[PDB]
Each structure stands twice: as C-alpha cells, then as structure tokens.
C-alpha cells in the first residue's frame, strides 16, 4: 500500500533525571537499526553544544 507503520511508544523511563531510556514500537522490519544508527551518529558528532 506504500503507507508504513508508525510506532506507538509505551514508555519514556527517566531514571536519574539525566539518563533516559526511551522505547519505540513498532517499526518496519529494518527501520529499527537505520533510525538507531542515524540518531547515534548524529548525536555523537553533529550536535551543537558548548565545552
């Protein structure tokens, strides 16, 4: 149908108020890895801040 499945997350756990654990469900059969990888590579390197 070319209309995908967008997730319906269940939890945003916020232990320690600075160390979060988000969950998302569901994704396509391969979208999990692709979104995780893109987000990781962006957040590690390309994320404007200050130091």
């Amino acid at each position: 149908v070319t209309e995908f499945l967008k997730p319906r997350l269940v939890d945003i756990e916020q232990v320690s108020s600075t160390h979060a654990k988000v969950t998302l469900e569901p994704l396509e059969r391969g979208f999990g890895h692709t979104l995780g990888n893109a987000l990781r590579r962006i957040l590690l390197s390309s994320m404007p801040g200050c130091a």
């Binding site: 893109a38 987000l39 962006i42 390309s46 994320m47």
Partner: peptide
Amino acid sequence: ATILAEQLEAFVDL
C-alpha cells in the same frame, strides 16, 4: 530529530 529533518528538507515534497 529536528536537525535531521532540516537536513532532509530539500527532498520531501508533502
């Protein structure tokens, strides 16, 4: 998420 959407902006058409 916003930074990647801005990256993509010049491609999507909706």
